Amino acid sequence: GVDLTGISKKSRVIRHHTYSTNPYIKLLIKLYKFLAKRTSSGFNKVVYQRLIKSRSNRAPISLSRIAVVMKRKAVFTAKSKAAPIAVVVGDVLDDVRMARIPAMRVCALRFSKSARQSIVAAGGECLTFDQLAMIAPTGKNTYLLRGRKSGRESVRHFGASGVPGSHSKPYATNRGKETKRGRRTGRSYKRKAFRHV
Amino acid sequence: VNYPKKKVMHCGDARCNAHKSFKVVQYKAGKARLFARGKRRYDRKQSGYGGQTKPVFHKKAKTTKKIVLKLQCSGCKSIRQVVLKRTKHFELNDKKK
Amino acid sequence: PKGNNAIPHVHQKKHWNPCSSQKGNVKVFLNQPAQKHRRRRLRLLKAKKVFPRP
Amino acid sequence: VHSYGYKSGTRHLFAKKFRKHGVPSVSTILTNIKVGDYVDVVADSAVREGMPHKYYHGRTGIVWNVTPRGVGVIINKPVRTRTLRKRICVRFEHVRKSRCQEAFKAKEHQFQAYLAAKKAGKALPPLQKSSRLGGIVRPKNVEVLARRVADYEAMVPY
Amino acid sequence: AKSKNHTNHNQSSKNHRNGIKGPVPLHLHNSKRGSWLPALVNARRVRKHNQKAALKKRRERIAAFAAK
RNA sequence: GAGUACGACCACACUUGAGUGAAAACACCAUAUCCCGUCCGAUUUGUGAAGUUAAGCACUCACAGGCUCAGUUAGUACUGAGGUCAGUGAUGACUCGGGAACCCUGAGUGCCGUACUCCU
RNA sequence: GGGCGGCAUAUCUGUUACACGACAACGCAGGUGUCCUAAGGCGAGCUCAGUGGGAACAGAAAUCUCACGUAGAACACAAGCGUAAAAGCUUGCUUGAUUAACGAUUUCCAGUACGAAUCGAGACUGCGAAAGCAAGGCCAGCGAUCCUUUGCGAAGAAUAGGAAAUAUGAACAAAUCAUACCAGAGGUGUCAGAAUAAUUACCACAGGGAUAACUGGCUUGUGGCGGCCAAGCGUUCAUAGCGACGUCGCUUUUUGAUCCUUCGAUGUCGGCUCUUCCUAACCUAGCGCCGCAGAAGACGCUAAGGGUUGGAUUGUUCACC
RNA sequence: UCGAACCACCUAGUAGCUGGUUCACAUCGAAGUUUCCCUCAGGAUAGCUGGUGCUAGUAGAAGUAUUGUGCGGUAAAGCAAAUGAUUAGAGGUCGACCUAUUCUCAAACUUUAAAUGUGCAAACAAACCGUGCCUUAGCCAACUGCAAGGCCGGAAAGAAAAGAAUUAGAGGCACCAAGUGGGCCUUCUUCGGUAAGCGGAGCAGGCGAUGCGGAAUGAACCGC
RNA sequence: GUACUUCUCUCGUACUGAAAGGGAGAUGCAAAAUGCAUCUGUGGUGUGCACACGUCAAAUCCGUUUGAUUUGCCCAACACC
Ligand SMILES: C#CCOc1ccc(C[C@H]2NC[C@H](O)[C@H]2OC(C)=O)cc1
Ligand SMILES: [K+]
Ligand SMILES: [K+]
Ligand SMILES: [K+]
Ligand SMILES: [Mg+2]
Ligand SMILES: [Mg+2]
Ligand SMILES: [Mg+2]
Ligand SMILES: [Mg+2]
Ligand SMILES: [Mg+2]
Ligand SMILES: [Mg+2]
Ligand SMILES: [Mg+2]
Ligand SMILES: [Mg+2]
Ligand SMILES: [Mg+2]
Ligand SMILES: [Mg+2]
Ligand SMILES: [Mg+2]
Ligand SMILES: [Mg+2]
Ligand SMILES: [Mg+2]
Ligand SMILES: [Mg+2]
Ligand SMILES: [Mg+2]
Ligand SMILES: [Mg+2]
Ligand SMILES: [Mg+2]
Ligand SMILES: [Mg+2]
Ligand SMILES: [Mg+2]
Ligand SMILES: [Mg+2]
Ligand SMILES: [Mg+2]
Ligand SMILES: [Mg+2]
Ligand SMILES: [Mg+2]
Ligand SMILES: [Mg+2]
Ligand SMILES: [Mg+2]
Ligand SMILES: [Mg+2]
Ligand SMILES: [Mg+2]
Ligand SMILES: [Mg+2]
Ligand SMILES: [Mg+2]
Numbered sequence A: 001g002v003d004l005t006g007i008s009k010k011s012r013v014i015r016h017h018t019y020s021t022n023p024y025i026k027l028l029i030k031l032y033k034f035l036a037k038r039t040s041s042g043f044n045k046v047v048y049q050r051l052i053k054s055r056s057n058r059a060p061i062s063l064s065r066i067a068v069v070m071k072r073k074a075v076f077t078a079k080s081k082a083a084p085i086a087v088v089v090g091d092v093l094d095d096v097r098m099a100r101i102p103a104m105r106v107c108a109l110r111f112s113k114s115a116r117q118s119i120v121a122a123g124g125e126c127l128t129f130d131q132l133a134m135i136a137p138t139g140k141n142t143y144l145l146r147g148r149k150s151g152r153e154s155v156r157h158f159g160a161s162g163v164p165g166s167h168s169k170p171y172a173t174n175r176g177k178e179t180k181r182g183r184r185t186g187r188s189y190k191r192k193a194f195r196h197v
Numbered sequence B: 001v002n003y004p005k006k007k008v009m010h011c012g013d014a015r016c017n018a019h020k021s022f023k024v025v026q027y028k029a030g031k032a033r034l035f036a037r038g039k040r041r042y043d044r045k046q047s048g049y050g051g052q053t054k055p056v057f058h059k060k061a062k063t064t065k066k067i068v069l070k071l072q073c074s075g076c077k078s079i080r081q082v083v084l085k086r087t088k089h090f091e092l093n094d095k096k097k
Numbered sequence C: 001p002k003g004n005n006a007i008p009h010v011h012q013k014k015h016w017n018p019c020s021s022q023k024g025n026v027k028v029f030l031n032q033p034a035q036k037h038r039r040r041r042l043r044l045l046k047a048k049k050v051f052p053r054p
Numbered sequence D: 001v002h003s004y005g006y007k008s009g010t011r012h013l014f015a016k017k018f019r020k021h022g023v024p025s026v027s028t029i030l031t032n033i034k035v036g037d038y039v040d041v042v043a044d045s046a047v048r049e050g051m052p053h054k055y056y057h058g059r060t061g062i063v064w065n066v067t068p069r070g071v072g073v074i075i076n077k078p079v080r081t082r083t084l085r086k087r088i089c090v091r092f093e094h095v096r097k098s099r100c101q102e103a104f105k106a107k108e109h110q111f112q113a114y115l116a117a118k119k120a121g122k123a124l125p126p127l128q129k130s131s132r133l134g135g136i137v138r139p140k141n142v143e144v145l146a147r148r149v150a151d152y153e154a155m156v157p158y
Numbered sequence E: 001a002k003s004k005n006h007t008n009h010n011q012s013s014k015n016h017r018n019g020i021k022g023p024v025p026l027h028l029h030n031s032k033r034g035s036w037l038p039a040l041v042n043a044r045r046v047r048k049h050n051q052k053a054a055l056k057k058r059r060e061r062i063a064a065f066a067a068k
Numbered sequence F: 001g002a003g004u005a006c007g008a009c010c011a012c013a014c015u016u017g018a019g020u021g022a023a024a025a026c027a028c029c030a031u032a033u034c035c036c037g038u039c040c041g042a043u044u045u046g047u048g049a050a051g052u053u054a055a056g057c058a059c060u061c062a063c064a065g066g067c068u069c070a071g072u073u074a075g076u077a078c079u080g081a082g083g084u085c086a087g088u089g090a091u092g093a094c095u096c097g098g099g100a101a102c103c104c105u106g107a108g109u110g111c112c113g114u115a116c117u118c119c120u
Numbered sequence G: 001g002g003g004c005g006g007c008a009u010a011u012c013u014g015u016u017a018c019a020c021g022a023c024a025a026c027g028c029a030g031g032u033g034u035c036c037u038a039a040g041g042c043g044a045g046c047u048c049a050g051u052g053g054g055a056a057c058a059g060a061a062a063u064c065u066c067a068c069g070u071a072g073a074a075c076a077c078a079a080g081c082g083u084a085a086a087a088g089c090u091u092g093c094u095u096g097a098u099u100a101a102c103g104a105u106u107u108c109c110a111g112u113a114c115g116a117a118u119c120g121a122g123a124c125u126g127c128g129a130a131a132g133c134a135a136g137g138c139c140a141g142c143g144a145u146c147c148u149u150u151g152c153g154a155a156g157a158a159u160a161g162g163a164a165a166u167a168u169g170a171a172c173a174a175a176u177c178a179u180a181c182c183a184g185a186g187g188u189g190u191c192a193g194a195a196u197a198a199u200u201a202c203c204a205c206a207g208g209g210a211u212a213a214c215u216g217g218c219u220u221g222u223g224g225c226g227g228c229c230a231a232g233c234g235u236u237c238a239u240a241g242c243g244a245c246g247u248c249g250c251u252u253u254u255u256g257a258u259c260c261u262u263c264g265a266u267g268u269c270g271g272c273u274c275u276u277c278c279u280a281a282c283c284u285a286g287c288g289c290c291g292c293a294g295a296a297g298a299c300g301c302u303a304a305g306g307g308u309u310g311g312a313u314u315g316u317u318c319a320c321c
Numbered sequence H: 001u002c003g004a005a006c007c008a009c010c011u012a013g014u015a016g017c018u019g020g021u022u023c024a025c026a027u028c029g030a031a032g033u034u035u036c037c038c039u040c041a042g043g044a045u046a047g048c049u050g051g052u053g054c055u056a057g058u059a060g061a062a063g064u065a066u067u068g069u070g071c072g073g074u075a076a077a078g079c080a081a082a083u084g085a086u087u088a089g090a091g092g093u094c095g096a097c098c099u100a101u102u103c104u105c106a107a108a109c110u111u112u113a114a115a116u117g118u119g120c121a122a123a124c125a126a127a128c129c130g131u132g133c134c135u136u137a138g139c140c141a142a143c144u145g146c147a148a149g150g151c152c153g154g155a156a157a158g159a160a161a162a163g164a165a166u167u168a169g170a171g172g173c174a175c176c177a178a179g180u181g182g183g184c185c186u187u188c189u190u191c192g193g194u195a196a197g198c199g200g201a202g203c204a205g206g207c208g209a210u211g212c213g214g215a216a217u218g219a220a221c222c223g224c
Numbered sequence I: 001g002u003a004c005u006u007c008u009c010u011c012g013u014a015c016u017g018a019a020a021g022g023g024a025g026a027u028g029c030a031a032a033a034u035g036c037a038u039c040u041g042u043g044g045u046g047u048g049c050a051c052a053c054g055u056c057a058a059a060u061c062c063g064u065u066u067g068a069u070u071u072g073c074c075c076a077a078c079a080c081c
């Protein structure tokens, strides 16, 4: 025998196939699996990994977020160079809080109907991942983007709300209930809002 | 325990903001009202058949009570309550030993 | 163990379930399509009787 | 029987050394403690104000807070499967400046001095040679190592 | 019927299976909350000015890049 | 080579006897109207300068007691790891490592700062 | 086992505890539910316990005086630690034992409360010439929800709820009344907190060999049986016979200790009957030795082949005749 | 059928207790411990375990060393050192009392004091250098001095040489949950007990959950 | 069953307070007890995929790839404000 204590703890949960039943997702995975192994680009490898990911791990992105980070890169970019193609492995959703956006080329798995209308009306173009593979096979001049997930309600519930320093929402259908003892100093004690780590 | 009849302490009222002489009086609980909300609920619960509807405490263990003092500022007439440690014999004595 | 869950208030502590010893207290809607057809049939029958009144 | 109070089992821990009793000296009072310093948390039994708990006695940590009479020290403490960074509040008399980085600080300063000397035509000190190498040995005196009869009679008392 | 009162047997083995994790580094979770207030208040004034300096500095860099 | 004031470390600086002490200090010392405090100008406080190194103080001495650093005690006591080692056992030795303490004995008997002053 | 007892039920000191921390027992030795307007705070002076010398009545011990005195005293109460121009004693003035914007932390620990602490920021102060020192007496001395009860939201200003006027009783106003928000107090000692007397042999159920009573098993304190040494006893003479003070064993025919097996069951004492086995040998076969004349006996060795009774009383085993 | 008859019903009454619980292979794989509970045959709660992953694949690594730098009062030793215990002479009618030492000791005694341990550090968000620059209602009588947050530069055996580390050395972050919460045996340490295949602990291995090869035979011994 | 419809209802886009009741952008200029101006914009800082500029090392079938690193922007996240 060989002493291999805790060797199984070194292994990691790595998925190679997708759980998706979408045939067009499988076509994209087939296309970008080929590109991630026959090209040297790091963009194709990252895109291929994100196509295998679950829906929860492909958070959607707002149109205002794309335009903001595009402007942060538009400055400090030479006028000779064209703007990169924004690529997100996920959904692009419209944002009613920002009406005036520049013309951008956006590639995404799915566009909401309003988001596609807003991109086109600004002079931009909504791209498709098989179109991207033909104009940027190695991902040259692209802006890979991810949607936000820290604001999800599931994340806001994670952890115990009764321990000091915690601010997670409890699981409760009634908002008025679960507010008296343990939440106010007058009723026995209050859960401490801050704790040094 | 012997306690002075007058105490000079800080009066936090906006018209004093200084150390003033306070008259010392032991706190005594007031009478239970008949029309306090909990009393009204208790009387409604106790009516009719069913006997004693609430617990009645019996296993007394303490032999003392915490001492509470009502201190009244001479000028503002406001009252402040302070808590002393438990004692078996609390006495207000101006005569220093 | 229990874990972090909502405190349940599902009620259902009465004799609602029909079984032996309990008639139950339930109401299903398996007759909903048939009653919907009947109501439309009755409305069309009534219009013929009161014709030409609205 | 046995109890677990704040100062339980500290009969020898919180005691002065023999003939070394007394309150802290002036040099302790004049010592400057800054945020980010390394300090050893050694309780002074003659100052029964702001003493650390007996666990933190003999632990070295990093100062995170300085207050008119007190020092905030972050101390690692293993609990079950992890180590927590515990912040303790003590008076200044219970902390000593730690020399735990003295060898590392000297190593850095030697490198700077060597670099400056090498930069501008100075003679570097000669490199020390290993003592484990071979060589010829000329013995001035040679003695016989043996067990004698006298050795056996010398270990018998009475 | 009496049972065992207490033992620490197997506990160190359990605590080392997923190992005893090291402490968080000093540069993380270095909150100043609860520290000496007079120094905390003064540090906030400097940090507020530093943010204003950072905002202005990016404005100069953007103009300088557009200058060429 | 010394003194004074403030000191750092806090006996190699302490304790007991004995001797010596330039200068300038320090100190004993004189006194009680005022400031002040006491049973008592003893201590303390004020005002002084006639006297004295007699004490304090500083040095030096002692096969001095302590204390400090070494050596011995001693690779001893103890101890981490090992044996299908010895022994009925009590226990012990062995192998790879670590390693004391008192007694006893040798040497030593403060040191380092800031300011002012004497020697000058 | 349970019961009775006690409390190891909440909690403090020393030790067990194996020189970080942590560690059990109905382990060991002791504590806690209080006490204190000072026994809290501060400043200043002083030095304690004990000795030795001396002083009318005065002595072992009354008070006065001089030396010595590292704490050998004291600091409410257990213990440890700490402390000498103090942390002890005396004294003078005091209320830092108040308030303290939900600051942070430690101990227990799930890194939750509670109780105790620690480091702070603000107000008003007490002492001090001042640096400073104090928000109790360092470390044990205490309490959730609901309910009850108390304090705080003074008066006067605002053309409009504002930077600053507590709120509600939901059609609207006034005055009561009742609520609400914040901080305490009345208590749970089974001390993270039900409101609780017996009996059952007339008894019942679910279970437990997690747990007693009976057989076995481990142990052998106790019981029983023996050795070794040799003070004495034996007129004399330690050892014919035996053997104090000690010490080393064996046995499982006594009791105790334990709780491994059995609680969906291993039929409980005694006797009767019948067989077999052991030897630490009563008789029977040999043989030594003697305080061995004989007779009768004592002690010892080899040997379990053979034998080891009839009755009164008692259920008895034992016991006694 | 009687210390509360019989018949039907509520009633499939409740049971922390006893019994049962139906196919295969594969990848992983425990716990009998903590805290709270009218809690002790049971639960919650951490820990151990699986699944799902997330994140820039050597990153904030380590049940191990070395070198520096801290902590300690057990083994030992000592009583000719404090606190307790204690035998005997000697030196200053009998003794007492002093002075010196001497026979023997301590879980709740110690001057001293290990071995084994235990905390921290050993250059990539860091540290070092330029009285370089900005800011502050911070400190100081002020200041170019200290404190703090930054900015701009410089240098960086990326850590030499002296025995001068090594790694089957991808670090961090989550989510959802199961069983378990009767243990037992050995090595050293160790408490009660005359002792026990007895009761109770510390460290670490092991059985439980595991066979195989050996000690004839044996859950735990030896080897593996 | 399938096809069709809803000025509704519900869960969210806003949360706080016991309630009366209030109710969240950035930058600049400035300090008005409701201050002004502008609207293509991550509030700031540290660590941070890809991508873009380079710059080294190794290997190349000489086309490149495969590691490291500088600078810019940094997505998602984490930590201080
Ligand atoms: C009263 C009394 C003491 O005497 C006894 C006598 C018999 C028993 C029965 C047990 N003997 C072994 C098994 O455990 C049980 O067997 C059975 C058939 O139940 C218990 C105690
Ligand atoms: K208001
Ligand atoms: K049975
Ligand atoms: K015979
Ligand atoms: Mg959100
Ligand atoms: Mg679990
Ligand atoms: Mg559980
Ligand atoms: Mg859940
Ligand atoms: Mg029926
Ligand atoms: Mg100890
Ligand atoms: Mg100690
Ligand atoms: Mg047992
Ligand atoms: Mg148990
Ligand atoms: Mg003189
Ligand atoms: Mg003289
Ligand atoms: Mg230890
Ligand atoms: Mg310990
Ligand atoms: Mg006093
Ligand atoms: Mg004093
Ligand atoms: Mg508390
Ligand atoms: Mg207390
Ligand atoms: Mg105090
Ligand atoms: Mg006091
Ligand atoms: Mg106290
Ligand atoms: Mg105090
Ligand atoms: Mg209590
Ligand atoms: Mg309890
Ligand atoms: Mg009868
Ligand atoms: Mg059974
Ligand atoms: Mg049993
Ligand atoms: Mg039997
Ligand atoms: Mg026996
Ligand atoms: Mg027996």
Ligand SMILES: [Mg+2]
Pocket: G259
């Ligand atoms: Mg039994």
Ligand SMILES: [Mg+2]
Pocket: none
């Ligand atoms: Mg039977």
Ligand SMILES: [Mg+2]
Pocket: none
């Ligand atoms: Mg059976």
Ligand SMILES: [Mg+2]
Pocket: none
């Ligand atoms: Mg039978």
Ligand SMILES: [Mg+2]
Pocket: none
């Ligand atoms: Mg025989």
Ligand SMILES: [Mg+2]
Pocket: G304
């Ligand atoms: Mg025979």
Ligand SMILES: [Mg+2]
Pocket: G304
């Ligand atoms: Mg026979």
Ligand SMILES: [Mg+2]
Pocket: none
């Ligand atoms: Mg009948």
Ligand SMILES: [Mg+2]
Pocket: H016, H041, H042
């Ligand atoms: Mg149960």
Ligand SMILES: [Mg+2]
Pocket: none
């Ligand atoms: Mg079963």
Ligand SMILES: [Mg+2]
Pocket: none
């Ligand atoms: Mg496996």
Ligand SMILES: [Mg+2]
Pocket: E001, E002, H040
């Ligand atoms: Mg039990």
Ligand SMILES: [Mg+2]
Pocket: H041
């Ligand atoms: Mg069970």
Ligand SMILES: [Mg+2]
Pocket: none
């Ligand atoms: Mg069971």
Ligand SMILES: [Mg+2]
Pocket: none
């Ligand atoms: Mg010993």
Ligand SMILES: [Mg+2]
Pocket: F101, F102, H077, H078, H112
């Ligand atoms: Mg010794």
